[model samples]
Target: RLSWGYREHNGPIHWKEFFPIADGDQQSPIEIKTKEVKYDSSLRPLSIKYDPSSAKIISNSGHSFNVDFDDTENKSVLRGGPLTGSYRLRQVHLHWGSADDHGSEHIVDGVSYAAELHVVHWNSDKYPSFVEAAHEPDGLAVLGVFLQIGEPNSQLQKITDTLDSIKEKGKQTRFTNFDLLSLLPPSWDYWTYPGSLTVPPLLESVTWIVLKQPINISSQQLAKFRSLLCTAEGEAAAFLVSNHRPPQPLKGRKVRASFH
Candidate 1:
C-alpha cells in the first residue's frame, strides 16, 4: 500500500525517460472523447467456463494477492466481452492510489477513479502459453472494471476479509474454496481496443476490454484500501499508494463501444 504519487524526478513520465526503449510504444491515459468506430461483428466467443475449483487468492510477495484463475476450467474465446475471441480468465488484481478517485491506469475521456480491477485472460487457441500470448496484440485480453465511490460492495468483502492475513509486504494468504466469478458485474457488454499493459515492459500486444458498467464501493471501503501499506508493520519504512501507473497515449487506436 505504498503511495504511488508521481513526482518530477521519479514519476511515470520519469519512468518512461528512465527506460525509453522498453516503454517507448506504451499508450495509456486515453481521453474518452472521440468518435465511435466499427469492429468485426462476426467475432464469436467460445464460451465462459470459469470454475471456482482450485481457485486460490494470495498476496504476491506483498505486491498483490490477486485471485488465481484456473485457466483449464475457463472456456472463453477471443470474440467475447466486446473484444474478438474467447479469452480465458487467468488472474485478477487491483491498482490503487493513496487517495480516492485516482488509481486506475486508463482514464475514460480523461476521467480518473480511486482504483481499477484487471481480469487477465489469454488467447489459448492462438498461443500455447500465457506468457507467449501476452506478447502479441491479440494474444492477451484484460477486462477493465472501474471501482467508484458508492454503496458498500458485498462482493468485495471476501477479499478485504483476507487482508489481515496478507497485510505485510511479501506476505501471502492462501484462500481456498473461493469463487472469483462473484466479483464480476452481471453484464458482458464492454468497449474493446488495442493497448499495452499499464505496468512495466509496456508491451503493446493486449486486447483491452473495458466494461461500461462500474461497480460500487463505499468511501469506507476505499479508506480501508488506503490503510494498505507497502510492507507489514514492525518493518522498516512504510510506503503508501505503491501501485498506479500514469495513463498512456491513445496512439490513434480505435475504442469500439459495445453499447449503441
Candidate 2:
C-alpha cells in the first residue's frame, strides 16, 4: 500500500511518488502575489448558508481534525462568489506548522499566516456525490480562511474544547451545533483561483476561494492544535506539529481578486 504521511520519508516532497497529480499544473496552495492578481469586478458576492445543527462529528484524520457536516441535503450550502451553482458543505479542516509565523499552506505576498482552514464542499448541482465530483475539474469548491496569531477567538473554543476527545488518529466524538459563520472574518473579499487538494490523491477538482482577511487565534489555542498526535493508539506517538503543504507552482494560472 502506498501510505502517505508527514515525515522525513513520506512528506509533501515525496507525494509525487505515489500521486502523480502532485506535479500537475492545477496544484493548490500557490503563492498569491497581490500585484499579480487581477481584480474581477464581475465576481458575485458570496452567498453562504450554514446550519449550526448540520455538524455531526469531529475526528482525527491522521493529518488534522476534521469536523464533518451533514451533507445529505442543501441545508448547508455555498453559492455565488465565482461559482456557477450550489456547492454543498461537507467538512472543514485545518493545516498548520511547527511555529506560529509560517504554518499556512498558501503564501500571500510572500507572507505565510500562522495556519489555514479549508472548508471543503462539492458541487452537488452537477455531481451526485462528493466521490463522483472528486474526479472532475469543476467538481469542488473549497473556502480557504487564513488564521493569524492574535487575540483568542471565542468561536474556535467550541472546536478546541474537543481536542482531548480526539487526540489520536481515527478517534472521534459527537460534535454538533458548530457556529461556523462565527469563525469567518467580516469581509468576504477573496482571491479566487483553480487548484487541487493539498493532500494526497491530489485531485485537480477544486475552485479555491481564499479570503483576504484572516481570523484570530491566540498562542494558547494554537498550542492545542499542535498537541494532536499524528500516530494512532498503540503506535509510537508523534505530535502533529506541522501538517501544512508548502506553496506549489502557479504554472501560468491567473489569480483573481473579488475586491478592487
Candidate 3:
C-alpha cells in the first residue's frame, strides 16, 4: 500500500518539485490543434468482452474505488503489430475533473478532456497482478479511453447511481449482478506506444492502447463525478479533485499509431 504523507511540496501539491525541468516541458495538457498525420481507419473494428457483473469495486488504498475484475478479457480483431496476444482484464478506474471540462491526466495536443478511463489488463500467460505485470516489456496493456463532454453515457450510470452508497472514505460496496463487459465501444482502432503510468510510483513498460474515438457524457452526468469526495466526518475535507496528475514526457519515445 502507498502511504499518503503530508510533506512540504511533496505529495500532490508539489509533485513538480520532484522534477522541476519536466514541469515546464511541452507535455500533456497540450492543445489538440493539428494532427501530424491522417488518422488510419484500418485500426477499426475493435471489440471487448467485459462483464460488469464480474467487476469488484474495492476501495483500494491507493486513491479511488478501483473497480477490479476476476474474469474480464480483451482482444482486438485487427491483425499485425503489437496486439497479437490475448490480454486478460484486470481493473478499470476513472479520473475526472472537479468540473465538466478539464480533468484528464494526458492532454491532447494541448486540450484536456473532462475525464479519462483506464482499463488495465495483462498478458495472462505471463504475470498475474497488474502491479507485477506492468514491470515487464510485454507484461501489461492499458486501454486508455478519453472521456469528453457531450451526451449522457448510460454505461457510466451503472456506477454513478451507486456512488452514493459508497460515498464515505475507506468504505467499499460489492457491485454484483452488474454486467461490466458492455461498457466499451465497438471499434478497436487505437494509437499504440510505450509509456509510464500516469499516476504515482510512475513505472514504465506500459503499452498504451489509446482509442481515437472518445466516449461522451452529458454535463449533468459529469457533475455526478465531480461530487466524489474522500474524507470522513471528523477529518479535513478530502476534496474530489484528487485523482488527476500532470502528464509525463515522451522520453524520446515514438508513439506508433495503428493506421500508420
Candidate 4:
C-alpha cells in the first residue's frame, strides 16, 4: 500500500508521484516576500469567534494530532479579512520540525519559525461540508500562525498534557475546552493569498491567512508534540519529528497584506 508522509520513502519530494498536484501552481506554504506584498486597505479586519466548548476531540492522524471541532453549527467561525461569508471551524493542526530553527512552512522575509499552527475552516454558507467545500476556489479558509521559540505558552498546556495519550497513530481522546482564539497573536494583521493544502490532496481551495506576529512555544512543549508516532500501535515505531512542506513557487500570485 502506498502512503504519503514526511520521510525519504514517502516525503513531499516524492508526493508528486502520488498526488500530481503537489507541483501545481496554487500550492501552499509559500515564502511571503514582504517587500512584494501589496497593502490592501479594502480588506476587512478579521472577525473570529471561537467557543471553547466547540472543540470536541483530538486524534492522531499519523502525521499530526488534529484537534477537531463540532462544526455542525456556526458556533466557531471566521469572517472578514478578505472573506465574503462565515467560514466554520473544522479542525486545527500543527506542522513542526526536528529542531527549533526551521519548521514553519510559510517563511516571512526568508525567515522560518519554529513551527506553524493551522486553524482550518470551511465555507459553510456555500458548501454543506468541508469535503465538498475543499474542491471549490473559495470553499475553505485557513488561519496560519507561526510558533516561535520563546517562553512556554500557557494556552498550549492543554494540548501538551494530552500528547502522551495519543502517542500512536489512530489514537484519540475527548479534547475540549479550547479557547482557540487565545492561540492567536495579539495582532490581527496577516497576509492573504490563494493557495492549496500543504498536505496531500493538495487541493487549491484555501484562502491562506498567515499572521504577521508569532505565538510562543517553548522547546519543551514542542518536544511533547514530536513524541507522537507516525506509525500505528503495532507497526514499527517511527517518531513524527517533522511534518512541514517546503516553500512552493510563488507563480506570480500576488500576496495581499491586510496591514500597512
Candidate 5:
C-alpha cells in the first residue's frame, strides 16, 4: 500500500508524487500577513460547545497523535465565525518541530510558534459524514491554535501523560472527558482563510481559523511530544521530531480577521 509519512523518502517534498493536490492553490498552513489581512466586522463571533465526554480516544496516526471524538451527535460543535452551518467537532491533533524556535504550521507575519494545535470539525448540517465532507470545499473547519514555549500549561498535562501509552505508530489508549476549552488562550480573535488539510490526501475542504493569541506549553512538555515514534512497531524506530508542513502560497486568497 502507498503511504505518506515524514521521512527522507516520504516527506512533504515527495508527497506531490503520491498526492498530486500537494501543489493545489488552496493549500493549508499559509503565511498570514497581518498587513494584508482584512478586518471583517460582519464576521460572527465564534461559538463553541464542546462536550468533554465526546472525546473518545487518542492514537498515533503515523503522522501525529490524534485525539478522536464521538461525533455521532452535535453535542460538541462549532458555529458562527464565518460559518453558515454548524460544524461538529471530530478530532484534535498537534504539529510541532524538532526544536522550540519554529514548529507551527501556520506562520503569522513571518513568525512561527513552537507548535500548532488543530481542532478538526466537519459541517454536520450539510454532510452526513466527515469522510464525505472531506471532499468538498466549505465542508470542514479547523481551529488552529498556536503553542508557544512559556509557563507550564496544566491543561496539556492530560495529553502528555498519555504519550507513553501511545508512543509508537498505531498505538492508542482510552482518553475521554478532556477539557478542550482550557487548552485555548484567553482571546478568541482569529484570522480566517480557505485551505486544505495539512496532511496527505490533501483535501481542500478546511476553512482555516488561525487564532490570534497563543496558548502556552513548557519546553519539557514539548520534548515528550518529540519522543513519539513515526515508525510503527516491528519497523526501524524513527522519532517524529518534526511533523509540520511548511507555509504554502496564499495565491491571492484574502485572509479575514475577526478584529481590527
Candidate 6:
C-alpha cells in the first residue's frame, strides 16, 4: 500500500520502479574521496546566520524527525560559498541507523558516521517560491553535518529531550529556542558539491555543503532516537532504527574543498 520507504519492500532499491530518475547521473549522497577533491580559491567563505525564533515545531514525519522553520522571511539565512544569493532556512532533520556504527549518508574515505544532519535551505533570491525552485537545478542548498558518538552535546541534547513526545509518526510538539548556528562544529571548513536530496523524489536541485568536522553525540542519546516509532497513532508500531539512504555515485562531478 505504501511507496518508497528507506528499506524493505518499498525502500531505496525499489525506488527506480517509481522514479527512474533515481538512477540519474547527478544523484546525491556521494562518497567523498577527499584526496581527489580540488581546493578552489574562487569559492567564497560560507556565511551562516540563524535565529532561534525561526524554529517553530518538531515532528516525526514517518521517515525522519524534522524541525520546521518559518521561512516567510530571511530571519535565518545562508550565503556565500559557491552560492550567488541568500538561501533561506526551511527545516532541519537527521538520518540515522540502528546503532552507532553506520547511519550517515555521505561517506568520507569509506567511513560512515553514526548519523548525519541535514539543514535544508531554498534559494529565495532567484526564485519566487521554494516549491517552484526545487525543480530547477540550482534551487536548493543543504548543509550536512556528521554526528559521531562521544560526549553529550548541549545543543544536540535539546533535540533528544523532545523525542519521547514525538515518538510516533506525524507527532509534533512546540520546539523552539534552537540555536542551529551553534549546533555546527567549531570548524567551518567544508566540502561542497552539487547533488540531490537524499529522500523521495530525490530532486537534483541541491548544492551539498558537508562539514569536514564532526560534532559530539552520546550512545545513550542515539538510543532515544531509535525508540522512535515508524507508525503513527493507532497503527502497528515499528522502531525507526535507520533512516539513512546509501551513498549515490560521484558521476564525474568535481567536489570542491573550501580549505587547503
For each candidate, give its TM-score against the true structure. 0.83, 0.98, 0.78, 0.99, 0.98, 0.97
Per-candidate local distance difference test: 0.66, 0.93, 0.61, 0.94, 0.94, 0.89
State how far residue 215 of model 1 sits from its true place (Å): 0.3
Please state the error at residue 9 of candidate 6 in Å. 0.8
Error of 4 at 79 (Å): 0.2
Q: Write candidate 6's Cα lDDT for 1-260 as tens digits.
A: 35567659877787888778778888989999989999999989799999999999999998889999999899999999988799999999998998899999999999999999999999999888889879878999999999998898788877888999999998999988899998899998889998887887888999999999999788888778888888889998888889888888888898999999
Poorest lDDT segment (10 consecutive residues) of candidate 6:
1-10
Error of 4 at 199 (Å): 0.2
Model 1, 1-260: lDDT tens per residue? 13222443455665555445335543543545535545456544424555665566567444445777557644432345545556767777887777776777667766777778887888877778888988887888887888887788898887888776766766667666656566667776667777776665566777777776678777777666555556555876455454777766556666776665
lDDT of 3: 0.61
Task: Give the residue spans of candidate 2 off by over 4 A.
Answer: none
For candidate 2, give the lDDT of residue 116: 95
Q: Give per-candidate clash totals.
A: 36, 0, 19, 0, 0, 0
Model 5 residue 185 CA deviation in Å: 0.5
> What lDDT is obtained when candidate 4 is compared to the true structure?
0.94
Could you give candidate 2's per-residue lDDT for residues 1-260 as a string of tens digits?
A: 25688888899999999898899999988999999899998899899999999999999998999999999899899999999999999999999999998899999999899999999999999999999998899999999999999999999988999999999998999999999988999998999999999998989999999999999988899989999999999999999999999889999999999998
Best by lDDT: 4
What ranges in model 5 sit over 4 Å off? none
RMSD (Å) of each candidate, 1 decimal: 3.6, 0.8, 4.4, 0.8, 0.8, 1.1
Arrange candidates, best lDDT first: 4, 5, 2, 6, 1, 3
Residue 229 of candidate 4: its Cα lDDT?
Answer: 96
